[model samples]
Target: PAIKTEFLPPVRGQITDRNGTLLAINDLGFSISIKPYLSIKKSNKGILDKELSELTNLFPDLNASKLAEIYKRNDSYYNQDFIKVVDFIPYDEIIPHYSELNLNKTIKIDPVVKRKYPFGKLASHIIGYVGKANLQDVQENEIAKLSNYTGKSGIERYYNDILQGEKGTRVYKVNALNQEVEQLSYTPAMSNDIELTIDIELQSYLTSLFEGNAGAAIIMNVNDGSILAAGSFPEYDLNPFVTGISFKDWDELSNSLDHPFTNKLINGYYPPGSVVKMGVGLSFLNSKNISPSTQYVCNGSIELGGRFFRCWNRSGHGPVDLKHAIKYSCDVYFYNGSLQVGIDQISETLSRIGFGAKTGVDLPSEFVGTLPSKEWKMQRYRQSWFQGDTLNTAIGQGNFLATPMQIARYTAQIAKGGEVIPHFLKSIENNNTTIENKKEIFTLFEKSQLPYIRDAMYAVANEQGGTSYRYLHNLNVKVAAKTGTAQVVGFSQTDKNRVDEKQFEYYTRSHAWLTSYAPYSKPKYVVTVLLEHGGRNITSGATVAKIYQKMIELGYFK
Candidate 1:
C-alpha cells in the first residue's frame, strides 16, 4: 500500500456591499464525471452511452449525444482520468437523484461549487463573476483547475488572492484491492470575506433611474474617497457569464455600441468638456498668469491664430468673471484664460489635479487619459503646437481625454481641498485595508484658491443662470456642481450656422456631464454622471438631481 492524496478546491469567500449585503457567494452543487476507460471502442462506448442515458433521465434537458461527443473527442487509450460530463448540478436538483446516482459504478458524482449573484444584473460591473479553469488563463493554481473556476473580474478579481483560499489535502493509504486502507493526514482549506463601499440600495435605485440609458455614474464620499454607488449601464446579467456564455450572447455583447463589457467608470475616456473648467480655472491661478477674479467679455466666440472658436451659447454670456464663468460654463472665459496661462502650464496643472493619472482605485489597468500639451503634440503627430489646440484644451475638448472615474476623483479632491484616491473596497474581513499612501497632495497656492473655487461651484447649482440651475436646485442637500458638453464631431467653418444639438444624428450628438459634491458647507459625497450623446445639459443634470434625491431617501445625507 502506498500513501495517496486528494486535493479539494478551497471554498471561495463571500463578497458584500458596504452594509454587509451579500453580493457573491459559492453555492453547493454537484458535478458528474465518467470513470476512466471511456473511449471510441465498442465496450467503452456502451458504458458511456448507458451512463449518459441514465443522466438524461435525471436531467431531461441534458443531451446524451453531446455528452458522448465530448467524451470521445478527449478520450484515448492512455488517458486514465475521469471524463467530466456535467459541470454543475444545483443541490436541490441533484439531491433527489443522489441515491440513484451513487448506485452506478462507472459514474462518479462529487460535490462542486457554483457562483451565484442574488440580485442578478443589479451591480454586475462591480460584483463580477467567476469562470472555468483555463478560461482566459484565470485558473492559475492546479487545485483551481480541479474546481474549474476562478475569479474573472470586478471585486471578484481585484482581491482574488484573499477570496481564492488555498486548497485542502486528504492523504490516505490504498491496498492491492484499490480500496482506502487508512487515513494518513487531512487539512482544511481557508478563505476570507470582503466588504465593499457600495450600497446596493443606492445601486438599485440608480440603475432603475438609468434604465434604457447607456452611460456611467459614480457616487463617492469626498472626505474619504469611498465609492457609494457606481454603475455602467446597459448591464448584462452576471449569471450567464458564470455558467456558460453562448456565442450569440458573446457576439451581441461585443458588438453593442454601449459596450457592456467595459467598466465605463474607469475605462471610458472622453473629452472632459466644460466639467474640467474649474480645474482649468485653478490652473490659470496656479500659473500666476490670471487672477481668480479676472474678467472676460464673451461674445459667443474668440479669434486666435487666424481661427474662430465659438462658445456653446452662440449669443454669448456677456461680461463674466471666474465665478460667473464657472456657473454658466462659458467656453470663451477659459479660452482667454488658456491664452494667458499657456498650454504647458495648464497641462501640468491639470496633471496635478488628477486628470492625466489614475485614481488609484483597486481596479487594474486604470487608464491615464491624455493631457495634451506642446510637447505631446510634437511627440504624437510630429507637428508644431498650434494655439488652436491650446484653445480647444482650455475648453476641455480637443485632444484632452479623461475617464469618468478621474472626474469623480478630481471632484472629490476639489471638494475636500486635497488629493483623493477613489476606492471600492471598504475592508477585507471587516479590517480596513490601507490606502496606497497619504499626503497633502494639494499645493498651498492651490489650497488658497479652494475658497473661490468652492464658491463658484456652489453658484453653479444655486444661481439662476447656472447651467444646471434648472434641475440641480431641488435636492435633499445643497450641492456644488459643474455641467459640461463635449462634442463627438467638429463643425466645419463653412457650415456658417449650427443647429440645436437635437437636430444632429443621435450618435453624433455630444456627451453631457454633471459632476458635483453635496452638502456644500461640509461636503460628503461627490456624484458624477456622463450621459453618452445626451444632447443637452438638462438630461444629465436632471439625472444628477434625481440621484441626490434617492440618496436623501436612503438616508445617506444624514
Candidate 2:
C-alpha cells in the first residue's frame, strides 16, 4: 500500500439572515493549472500549445491568447510549478479531459471555492463580498495565503478571519487508483457559519418598498439592538465584486450621483436636522433654568446678534412648550431655547445619548460625525463659539451631524430609556457574544424626563396637527415619532439671510429625517428613515408607514 499526506481545505463559512436563508456561500469548484516548461521539456515533449487547445475545447468561452500570456509570464525554467490560469471552474462543468497517451499529465486539477449569493443584491452592502488577496492581505493574515480571498467590505470584511477557518490534514494508505485502502489519521477544519439579525423576508420587503428614491432606512429591536434591516440604496449585486467587477460597472457605482458604494447606514453623514431637539430639549430641562414653564413665543423669528433669526414657518406656531415644540417641530422653540441651554450643555446632552461617537456597530468602522461645542468650534475651525452657532445647531443644523445608524440607535436609546450597541450578528457557530443593554447613561433625574419626551413623540405620530400624524394613520399599531427637516425660506433672501449659510441650494426641505419607535406602549421596534435630497418634508413618511404595515404582515409586531 502507498501512503500520502493530504491537506484538506476547509469550506469558508456560510452567511445567512436571521432565518436559515443563505446570503453568502461557497460553491464547490476546481482550480485548473498547467505545469511549467512544457515548451522546453528535457524528456517529455512540449505540449503547452496543445493543452491550451484542449482546455479551450472544454471551456469554449475561455481566451487562449490571454491564458497563454499568463502562463508565459509566470512560468519559469528554474521553478517547475504548475501555473493556475483558471481561478474557478464549477464541479458540474469541470471534467478530466486530455488526449490519449497520458496527455492529462501536464494539467492539474485541485478543489477550489468561489463565493455565491443566493439572494442576489438584496443586502449586498451588508453581506459584502470576497476577492483575491494581495501581498498586504497575506502579510496581515496567514489564512488568506491558503484561501487567497479576503472580505473586501461590510460584514464579510469585519469577520474575515473568523470565517476563513483552518486547513485540516489527513494521512492515509491508498491504492494505485487513489482509493482509500486503510485510514491512518484525520483532523477536522475549524470553520464557522454566521447568522445575521436581518430577516430576508423583511429585507426583500424593504427593497420592494424602497423603489421611489435614493435614501436609507433602518429597522431594529429597541431593547437588544438587533438590526432587522438597514440599507443605502442604488443597490448593486455582490456577485460581480466576488470574482471581478467590470471597469465600467465599478466606475458607474463609485461615481454615481446616488452613491452605491457607501453603506449609508454607518458611513453617510448629514446634519442631525430637527431630530436633535429631544436631546437639546432634555438639555434645556436638565439645566433647570429656562423661560417660565419652558415655554417660548415663536413669533416666526427672534432677534440675535442684531439680526432677525427667522423660523421655517414665517408666521410661527404662536407660543410653544417643550412638548409642543417636539410634536410640531417648531424652529422658533429650538432657536430660542438653544440660547438658554447653550451649545456646551446641549452637546454634553447629545454626547451622552450616543451621538458624535462611534456607535460600536458590527460593521468594519464608521464615521463618528460632528458635535457642536464651544471647544469644538475652536479646534475644528480655529474660531470662537457664537450665539448664532447655537441657534443653527439647536435646530439640528450647523456643524452637528450623524449617521443613519446612529440615528436608529439614538431612537432606540430614547424608546427603551437606555443605551444599545447596534449589531447584525445573531450568532457565530460555536460562539455567542451578547451586548449590554444597560440604563446607566442617564441619571435618576434625567430618567424622570423620558416619559415627557415619549409623550411628546406620541403626540407627533398619534395626535392631530403633528408632523407625520396624517402619514401614519390607519395603521394597526401605535407609533411615537419625530420628523426632522431643514427650515425653508421663501424665494427672496438677501446676503444677510445667507449669514446662517443655509443649504437651500443643496435642497432645503429635501433632506427628510423621520426617527420613531412603535407599539407606543411597549416600544419594541424603532424605524428610522432618511431621504437624501428629499422632495418634501412630508413625503418620506409614506415610506415609513408602508414599512410598519409590512412588518405587521410579517409577524414582527407580534
Candidate 3:
C-alpha cells in the first residue's frame, strides 16, 4: 500500500554575504491569524474596523487609508500580523482588550517563520527581496502550488530555482470534534544551502561608503570571476515586507521618488561614460592592429570632415600614443583612433569583448546593452553612420549604454588574458558542483602593448597629468582607475552655471563612473563603481577606491 505522505519542509536555508555575515535568514515569528469565515459574523463585524485602527496607530507615521486597502484584500493578515501591536506590550495588554478589539475566539495566535535583513537599504537593490507570489509570478513560474517564498529580483530572481525550497506538509489524525488525537504519519523536508561569493565585511564597508548617495558598486574576483560584493544604494528594508506591509509602506516603497525596486547592478542602465574607456583602449589596440609605438598629435580637438570634437583636455595633451591616451584619457587620441578603426571596426571589436551584448552574468534582468552598427542606425533612426558617431562610441557615449557589471567583466578579461564568466552563488551544496567557466580567445593582446595599457591605467591614478590623480592622493596601494562623466543632458559650450557635478540634483547632468582592477601584485579583484546622475564630485570615486583599499587590508588577494 502506498503511504500517502508529504515531505516535511526542512528549515529554510540562510542567505549570507559571501563572508557569511547574515544577509537574510529564517526565524520563527509570531502571528495572529483570523478565520475569515469566522470573522464575518454579524457580532464581530462592527468592532473589527475600530479595533484595527487602534491596533495600527501604535506605529509611527502609519497611514490610515492603506490599512483600509489591506482590510479589503485580506483582513486575516491585518488582524493577525502583530504579536502585540505596541512593541514590548505584554499579554496583559491584549488580554484586557481582547473582546473590545475582536481578538478572542475568532482569531488564533500562531508561530510562523519569516525572513529578515538588518542591513536594509545598504544592499537593498542587490539582495533584492523575496516577494509573495502574485498573479504575475504565478503565471511565470507555475508557483501557484508552491508555498515557500521566492526570490523576486537581483540574485534572488536570477537563482530562484536554486535558492528556493519546498515547504513541508502537516498530517494529523483528527477526532470528530476536529481535535488531533494521535499522530498518523510524519516526514522530514530538506533544501540546499546557498553559499554566495559576496564578502559581507567588504559589502558593509562599500555600503557605508555609498551613504547619502545613489549608485552601485561591484567587486569581482578577477582570477575566477566570482562576484565578491555587488550592491546598489537607495536600497530598501526588505524585513518590512516579510509579515505584511501597510498600504502606506507599500506606497512609500513602490511609488516613491527613487525607485526602490530598481537594481542598479542588473537593471540600471547608464551611458558607460569614461569607464568604457578601459576596453576602448584595449579594443583599439587590437582592432587597428596598432603597435606600442602608435602615436598621434592632439591640438585639443580632432575634426573629422570638419566637425570638431574637443578632447576632455582643451589644453591639448600635445603628442600622445597608447600610453598617454589611457593615462590622460585624451578624447582626441581616441577620436583619431576611431577614424583609424571606423565605426564598424569599433562595433565588431566591442561585441567580441562583450560590449553591445549581455555579459551573460548569473544575475537577473541584465541588459545586453547597445553596440550599434551602421545598419542598426540606418534601420532605427534612418541616418547614415558618421565618423562622429564612431568617435562618440569609441569614447563610450551617444547611444552606448552599459551597466557597471559589464564594465567590470570586460576589464577582468583584459586583466586575466581570457574570457571569465561572472558567477554569483558560490556553489549549490547538494546537487551540482559550483558553476564556473573560462575560455580562450584566439586573439590576444600583444605582450608589448599589454604593458602600455596596464602602465597607462596606473598613470591615470598615479601620474601627475592623470585626470583621477587626486582621487588616489591618499591611497597606500597602487591604484589603476579611470573617471568618466556622462553628460546627463548636453549644454552648449557657453553655459554659465557650469553645474557642480557632485550634487545629486544633477543626476542627469552626468553619471560618474570608475572601473579598475588592482593591486598590481597579481590582480585578484576588479572593482567597478558608478554614481548615476551624480555630479563631478570625487566622493563616489573616493568611496570606490576605499573598497579596493579595504580588500587589500582584508587579504582578498591571498
* lDDT (CA) per prediction: 0.83, 0.80, 0.67
State model 2's lDDT. 0.80
What are the runs in model 1 whose C-alpha is more than 4 Å off?
A: 32-87, 100-108, 135-146, 176-178, 286-289, 430-437, 490-504, 535-538
The TM-score measured for candidate 2 stands at 0.83
Worst 10 residues of 3 by lDDT: 82-91
lDDT of 1 by residue, 1-558 (tens): 388999877778888888989899778898888886756566655677777776798798778878788877777777877888888888998888788878877888898777898888888888888876665454356656656677788887777766777778899998888788899999976677788899999999878777877789999998888899999876778988887899899777765556778888888899998988888888888655578777999999988868899988899989899999998999999999888888887888788878888889887678888989888888899999888888999989998899999999988889998878888888777224322226776788888988899899989998897888888877769989998887777644423233345544665677888999999989999999999889233379888988999899888887
TM-scores across all candidates? 0.86, 0.83, 0.79
lDDT of 2 by residue, 1-558 (tens): 488877765678889888778899888888778878765665646477787887788789788889888887787777768888888887777645423313567677787777898887789888988888878998887777777778888889998887887778898898988887887989966777888999999888777666655678899999888999888875678888887888888667654555777888888888888888888888888766663257888888899879887777888888889899888889899887888778888888889898889888989878898887888888889998889998988888877888998888888988988887789988886324322224477778788888888888998988898888998756899988889874444434553353345544644445789998898989899999888767333257888898899999988888
Superposition error at 431 for model 2 (Å): 11
Model 2 residue 339 distance off true place after TM-score fit, in angstroms: 2.0
Per-residue error at 252 for model 2, in Å?
A: 1.7
Clashes of each: 0, 1, 12
- How well does candidate 3 match the true structure in TM-score terms? 0.79
Collision pairs in model 2: 510-534
lDDT of 1: 0.83
